[PDB]
Amino acid sequence: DRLLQRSHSHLPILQATFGLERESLRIHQPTQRVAQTPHPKTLGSRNYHPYIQTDYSEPQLELITPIAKDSQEAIRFLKAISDVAGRSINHDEYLWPLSMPPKVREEDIQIAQLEDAFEYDYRKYLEKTYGKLIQSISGIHYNLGLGQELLTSLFELSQADNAIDFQNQLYMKLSQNFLRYRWLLTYLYGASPVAEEDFLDQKLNNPVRSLRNSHLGYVNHKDIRISYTSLKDYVNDLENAVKSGQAEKEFYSPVRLRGSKACRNYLEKGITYLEFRTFDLNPFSPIGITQETVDTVHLFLLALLWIDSHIDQDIKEANRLNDLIALSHPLEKLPNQAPVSDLVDAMQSVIQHFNLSPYYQDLLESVKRQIQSPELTVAGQLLEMIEGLSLETFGQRQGQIYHDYAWEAPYALKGYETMELSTQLLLFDVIQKGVNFEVLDEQDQFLKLWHNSHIEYVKNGNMTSKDNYIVPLAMANKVVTKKILDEKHFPTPFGDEFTDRKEALNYFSQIQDKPIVVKPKSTNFGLGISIFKTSANLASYEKAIDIAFTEDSAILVEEYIEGTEYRFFVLEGDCIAVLLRVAANVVGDGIHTISQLVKLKNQNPLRGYDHRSPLEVIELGEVEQLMLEQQGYTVNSIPPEGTKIELRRNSNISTGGDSIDVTNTMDPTYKQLAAEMAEAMGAWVCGVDLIIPNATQAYSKDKKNATCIELNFNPLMYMHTYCQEGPGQSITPRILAKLFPEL
Amino acid sequence: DRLLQRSHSHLPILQATFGLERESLRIHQPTQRVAQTPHPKTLGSRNYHPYIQTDYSEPQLELITPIAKDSQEAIRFLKAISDVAGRSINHDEYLWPLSMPPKVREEDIQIAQLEDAFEYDYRKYLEKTYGKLIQSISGIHYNLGLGQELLTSLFELSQADNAIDFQNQLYMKLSQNFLRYRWLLTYLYGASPVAEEDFLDQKLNNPVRSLRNSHLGYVNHKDIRISYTSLKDYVNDLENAVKSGQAEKEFYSPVRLRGSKACRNYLEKGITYLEFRTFDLNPFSPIGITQETVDTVHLFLLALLWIDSHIDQDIKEANRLNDLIALSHPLEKLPNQAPVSDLVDAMQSVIQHFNLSPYYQDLLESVKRQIQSPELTVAGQLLEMIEGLSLETFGQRQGQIYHDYAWEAPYALKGYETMELSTQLLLFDVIQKGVNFEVLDEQDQFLKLWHNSHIEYVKNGNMTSKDNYIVPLAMANKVVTKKILDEKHFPTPFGDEFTDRKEALNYFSQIQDKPIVVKPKSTNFGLGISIFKTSANLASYEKAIDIAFTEDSAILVEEYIEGTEYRFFVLEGDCIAVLLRVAANVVGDGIHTISQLVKLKNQNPLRGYDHRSPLEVIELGEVEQLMLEQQGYTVNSIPPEGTKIELRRNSNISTGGDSIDVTNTMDPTYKQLAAEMAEAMGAWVCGVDLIIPNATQAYSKDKKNATCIELNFNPLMYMHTYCQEGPGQSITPRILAKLFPEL
């Protein structure tokens, strides 16, 4: 009715709140059948989990996304959740991509096991009324709510009566037009051509574009009717027509009013948001839906407002059309009856009127092309895949494929590969274990996560309330950390940094005979690091100092301690792992040129070139070649069997170095020591770095066996779990469990 | 005896631990007499204060320095302590520069009031034995201990018998040679020519170089004798000769063994360090001693070891020489008897042998020059100053002068003008209130301070344990702080930063009609800030964005809120002050060219060019001139009466802006609000920054009266205490008091 499209383009029509719910059947691959298995022990209780749950049957898995500012933010949410679910599921099982089930078993569909008794009776009640089999069909729900600013600006132009009465009018107008033009959305994205056993008799009928949206599929209580003319009409009709209700949850409409506990309870408080169910899982998107699909639908929803007769008659008429479009064969074009020009013009008009992105023009044009040739529609891609009126061959094929994808970069969280690996893992644990979370910053790796009343702010993976206050204070310092350690009678090196070459020599006077290490504070691979086991000559020392300044602003000068460097990760009071790092290298095989040996080592999945990963790819760089020539070999030369050639002088993972889990070989005495050192800083999750000359021999202070070179209060955790060599150990889960003992 | 000078130059002879104790009489200027006043109420109890105390009389003030790595670190310590003492003393009183008293009053010298009863009896006991008058003489004590590394390396060459037996031998050798050649130190730095009343009869005798070191001055118990041949001999002789003891504290020697509770108690545990008392307060150094004096003495002490007969005879012989040198007239040269060539060669030899700094060669050469012409000696400068055999005219003159110095830069701590003003003040409070402290970093403004068992780590003045953990975590962020605030329903601007111009326009879509402010994250004076009260045009907006990138890496875009910006300082739960800042400016006086007006405003002591200070000097820079031309005026033009000319577009103290204390004019409602906002971050010492359009009108959320632009968790505190206009309020003391409720 209202024409606020008339309104100024400065208004943000695109503003909205998105939510995304996905249901899929867990499929047992060997048995080619529904899992018939318990909800995984890795996932977080079905009682509190916000993102992952079970819709009706125990097999049917539902992933619910937190609320999202953009369509984009919701999609990523769906991706991450789907990924956690991918890797949390039993390895034998996989997720069923199609809306239609794989095979039909009344026995297999067993009401999900829920602790709440009332849930059981309602699920039971539901089972009796419609039967177990219908509950198996899966789909995705699209939940949209309009931006307050968008709504408030719209409200100001039309009338001054009520935030709530107005919203309601608007929401109602939308739902109505949604039902009216829904057929289009169903047409573009029909994903349900056939059923293996669900459909009692339509094999003869043949493939239809969308069974799920079809009359025959989950459309009971034909007698039940709700007038959508007004919120009151819908609300009065719904309450009174409580037969379907058995509250009003049992009512099954294409678009459900939401944010309201009971129909009419919130008529007073407004429609919080509308939720759409028209969408059918899509086989080609791992998550089940595509961005383009999401934003198209968005503009489509939007067209309706712009394109604001009799609600009762027209909506009734459309069901005929929608069913017709739904029942129609995939390649078969849309009827002449459909008011296609009205929806297209509208969307076009919206874009033209509001100066929208060419991206939305790109989505409309694709919509038009599908109208031009039907294969383009989701159904058309789909038709070829179906064989013998069964896509079960295909479904298995896609479901397994996608399962491999879920396991494709085990370290990365599909939603968030941009962020630090350490945070990604933590985030993974959060999603599977059911903690609620907000990425407050992302860029800063800042997270807010909470369970119920309890809230924890963590930054960069391991920066938490548990760490004592001095840690954040001294985190940058290093020099300070040494002092409180030194005051605690702990083994330390003797070095002091000097700035601007200010009397560095005076320091040189301080330390001469003693082996010295000179390095810039930044301390990269060591493009600028100067190390003298030999006592530095005064001239030699000056040049080393000056290179440091060339490389960076602050020069660090330290005692040299001969030993092998190891990283201890301490959590609470106990060292949870230990790691050795070595300079990038390859070992000679009679057969292969060094260039080859490298290429071969880079074939490791952990080494990542395109995406950041636990290990870095080895590049036979200039720095490297020289190292090669210096060993007397060459990129081309072929090394001897078992001859280790070293590519980089100093050991770093970033340079392509190796991480080796040493937790079980390391002498326990030093693991102890690393944790006493963390205890002395009250650092809950610190990472200690000892230089140990003999890791087999036990540590004795008398022996000055070990000396703590550094102490990092944002240890990088992923390095310990994913190593070139060694087993590794899980770090991210343990921290989170300790953060939230309840959950 | 031992000749470890023979040892390799790589050994650090210079390594040592220094301490410095200074005693001065508080002098009442108007009364030209000893204060006769109670130890100040500003200072920290005489019961626990480590740095500031009273030696014998209540007037006599003693400043004790923590222990110092360099001579340099000790001097600065002395400076800071002397400065705190300068400004803590009553304004009427001042510190007496000369060792000799100003006037002599048996009545005026009243035993210092100490809570401990035993102290009283010992002070009483002391008063009866030697009388009140002698206790008034003041001097500085020089405490040196040799570096363990220096001692351990020395120990290794000579023998393997004992850390302790060896140290003892060494220490003993030093003290003995000290007594033997002490005369030289007394000669160079004699500062006691005459006494106004102390000296009963030597006016006829005439000016002597050093009365304080003279036999006649505080040299009682002539009968008492201690053999210094051996530690045992000194120890046995001392215990038995307990007559002087009345423990052994009453024994008064030029060099006292220290670090040992009782003579011989620690013979088993070693001489911890030697302490020298030869030095007499020096009139020309505000602190009473000079670096050159300190390092010379250092090499001198060192000569003795290199220059390692009969201890008893020679030490006895020297007292004759020392007294002679002490008694001798200031201009009068050193006797032919003095083995000057031996001490000089020795020091020379030390320098030559150990490859020491030319700086030490510079100190020796000065020593030689004083030998050449005696005026150079401290006494010679001094002789001219004394008039009518009384330097009391001079002492008043110097003491007052120095008092003005103590008050010279009230904001700066003389020891530490290098460090952030906020930290300097805090440090001041620490020193006067008697808290113990270590500057752990200095560069990072990192402090460890403690009282007894209790320890607090503070960084940058106001970073403490009291601040909740999220603050250090979110301190950098700003964007994060907004969120937890926004979640707490607090008034906020609508801005979001975009990085690398990534869809900034999309944001521009988000905000168009709304007044916008665009600025780089760095946010300097605004060399790169672009502000549009006017809605930004798309083209205009792009250029503003791009300038931000030219100026800095991250671009910030925010809502514009019209109002005047104010800084609230919140402590615990209560806003303790409020400040307005305005762009640098000058007001027209018919008479003066703008260049003049500036020069005149820069005459303010708070504006600092040479040293950093609460206010910055105004420079008629290019940026400024243009602002001038733009107002249509010019550096040269003469402005109208009361016409405010604005030098800088945006208001900053750094650019030369004005700080104005607004604490008492500000509407209380907003002071409240700023503290609720700090409470919501659990920020103990945060600094809130509101934009308030009407500071006289009360704040109403309905009115959206105020909006919190920023929130700083390292507020800069000095700005509030020292303002161009307004009274200001003390911030540094209150924080420290709350940190340590006991002290």
HEC string of A345-366?
HHHHHHHHHHCCCHHHHHHHHH
**Rounded (5°) CA angle B388-B391-B392:** 105
Sign of CA dihedral A646, A650, A656, A658: positive
Q: B177 and B64, same structural domain? A: yes
B686 Cβ contact partners less than 8 Å away, ≥ 6 residues apart: B467, B471, B570, B678, B711, B712, B713, B715
CB-CB contact of A88 with A42 (8 Å):
yes
Beta-strand pair A52-54/A60-64? antiparallel
Nearest-angstrom CA–CA distance, A272 and A171: 9
Closest by alpha carbon to B326, among B219, B214, B207? B214
Nearest-angstrom CA–CA distance, B386 and B173: 38
CB-CB contact of A59 with A109 (8 Å):
yes
Q: B529 and B624, same structural domain? A: yes
CATH number for the domain that contains residue B398: 3.30.590.20
**B64 strand-pairing partners:** B21
Tell me how far CA of residue A442 lies from CA of A20, A86, A459, B505, in angstroms.
21, 23, 10, 21
Which of A688-692's residues contact partners 24+ apart within 8 Å by CB, and which partners? Answer: A688/A567, A688/A568, A688/A569, A688/A570, A688/A575, A688/A712, A689/A565, A689/A566, A689/A567, A689/A568, A690/A565, A690/A566, A690/A568, A691/A561, A691/A562, A691/A563, A691/A564, A691/A565, A691/A566, A692/A563, A692/A564, A692/A565, A692/A566
**Phi-psi map region of B32: left, alpha, beta (phi>0 left; psi -120 to 50 alpha):** left
DSSP string computed for A637-682: --PPTT-EEES-SS--TTTTPEEEE-TTTS-HHHHHHHHHHHHHHT
Beta-strand pair A707-712/B52-54? unpaired
Looking at B631-707, list the stretches that DSSP marks H as alpha helix, in order from N- to C-terminal side. Answer: 668-681
Closest by alpha carbon to B432, among B66, B83, B718, B54? B83
**Rounded (5°) CA angle B43-B47-B48:** 75
Q: A392 and A455, same structural domain? A: no
Helices A340-354 and A358-372 cross at an angle (nearest 10°) of 170
CB-based contact B446 A473, cutoff 8 Å: yes
Residue numbers in A near B484 (CB within 8 A): 448
Residue numbers in B near A438 (CB within 8 A): 483
Q: A446 and A304, same structural domain? A: no
A611 Cβ contact partners less than 8 Å away, ≥ 6 residues apart: A409, A412, A417
Other Cβ atoms less than 10 A from the Cβ of A463: the count is 23
- B153 alpha carbon, distance to own chain's centre: 34
Q: B468 and B399, same structural domain? A: no
* Integer-rounded Cα radius of gyration of chain B: 32
B64 Cβ contact partners less than 8 Å away, ≥ 6 residues apart: B19, B20, B21, B22, B50, B51, B52, B53, B81
Nearest to B457 among A10, A459, A473 (CB): A473
Other Cβ atoms less than 10 A from the Cβ of A478: the count is 15
In terms of C-beta density within 10 A (0-12 exposed, 13-18 middle, 19 or more buried), how is residue A169 classed?
Answer: buried
Other Cβ atoms less than 10 A from the Cβ of A13: the count is 24
Q: B271 and B237, same structural domain? A: yes
Range of the domain at B537: 420-743
CB-CB contact of B673 with B637 (8 Å):
no
A-B interface: how many C-beta pairs under 8 angstroms?
70
User: Where is the domain boundary, B377, B399, B419?
Assistant: B419
CB-CB contact of A559 with A535 (8 Å):
no
A603 Cβ contact partners less than 8 Å away, ≥ 6 residues apart: none
A412 touches B: beta carbon within 8 Å? no
Question: Which residue has 């006016």 as its token pair?
Answer: B203
Q: B424 and B413, same structural domain? A: no
Nearest-angstrom CA–CA distance, B720 and B549: 33
Nearest-angstrom CA–CA distance, B187 and B184: 5
Give the count of domains, chain A: 2
Token pair of A572, please? 């609470």
Q: A511 and A570, same structural domain? A: yes
**Rounded (5°) CA angle A34-A99-A415:** 90
User: Where is the domain boundary, A419, A448, A475?
Assistant: A419
CB-based contact B444 A477, cutoff 8 Å: yes
CB-CB contact of A140 with A23 (8 Å):
yes
CA of B248, closest CA in chain A: separation in Å? 33
B361 Cβ contact partners less than 8 Å away, ≥ 6 residues apart: B351
Q: A257 and A115, same structural domain? A: yes
**Phi-psi map region of B54: left, alpha, beta (phi>0 left; psi -120 to 50 alpha):** beta
CA of B480, closest CA in chain A: separation in Å? 6
Closest by alpha carbon to B158, among B60, B11, B278? B11
SS3 B10: coil
For chain A, the maximum distance between any two Cα atoms, rounded to a whole number of angstroms, is 99
CB-CB contact of A191 with A294 (8 Å):
no
CB-CB contact of B636 with B628 (8 Å):
no
CB-CB contact of B59 with B26 (8 Å):
yes
Beta-strand pair A615-616/A607-608? parallel
CB-CB contact of A218 with A252 (8 Å):
yes
Backbone angles phi, psi at B414, to 5 degrees: -55, -40
In terms of C-beta density within 10 A (0-12 exposed, 13-18 middle, 19 or more buried), how is residue B465 classed?
Answer: middle
Residue B692 host element (H or E): strand B687-692
Q: What residues 459-518 of chain A have any CB closer than 8 A to a CB of chain B? A: 459, 463-465, 467, 469-470, 472-474, 476-477, 479-480, 483-484, 499, 509-510, 512-513
Closest by alpha carbon to A694, among A503, A561, A522, A531? A561
Residue B327 host element (H or E): helix B311-327
CB-based contact B510 A444, cutoff 8 Å: no
In terms of C-beta density within 10 A (0-12 exposed, 13-18 middle, 19 or more buried), how is residue A313 classed?
Answer: exposed
Nearest-angstrom CA–CA distance, B605 and A442: 47
Q: B372 and B467, same structural domain? A: no
Looking at A408-490, list the stretches that DSSP marks H as alpha helix, in order from N- to C-terminal side. Answer: 421-433, 470-474, 479-487
Q: A579 and A487, same structural domain? A: yes
- A132 alpha carbon, distance to own chain's centre: 33
A386: DSSP letter: -
Closest by alpha carbon to B723, among B664, B658, B648? B658
Beta-strand pair B607-608/B615-616? parallel
Nearest-angstrom CA–CA distance, A192 and A213: 8
Nearest-angstrom CA–CA distance, A565 and A689: 7
In terms of C-beta density within 10 A (0-12 exposed, 13-18 middle, 19 or more buried), how is residue A119 classed?
Answer: middle
Other Cβ atoms less than 10 A from the Cβ of A212: the count is 25
Q: A153 and A232, same structural domain? A: yes
- Where are any strands of DSSP class E within B573-651? 574-582, 585-587, 607-608, 615-616, 644-646
Nearest-angstrom CA–CA distance, A243 and B449: 75
Nearest-angstrom CA–CA distance, B87 and B424: 14
Return the residue in A13, A73, A359, A440 with the most chain B beta carbons within 10 A, the one to mutate for interface testing.
Answer: A440
Amino acid of residue B116: D
User: Where is the domain boundary, A396, A419, A442?
Assistant: A419
Backbone angles phi, psi at B290, to 5 degrees: -115, 155
Residue B122 host element (H or E): helix B117-130
B96: DSSP letter: -
Token pair of B516, please? 């916008």
Other Cβ atoms less than 10 A from the Cβ of B444: the count is 19
Return the residue in B509, B537, B713 with the most chain A beta carbons within 10 A, the one to mutate for interface testing.
Answer: B509
Binding residues of B for Mg(2+): 689, 710, 712
Other Cβ atoms less than 10 A from the Cβ of B131: the count is 12
CB-CB contact of A54 with A112 (8 Å):
yes
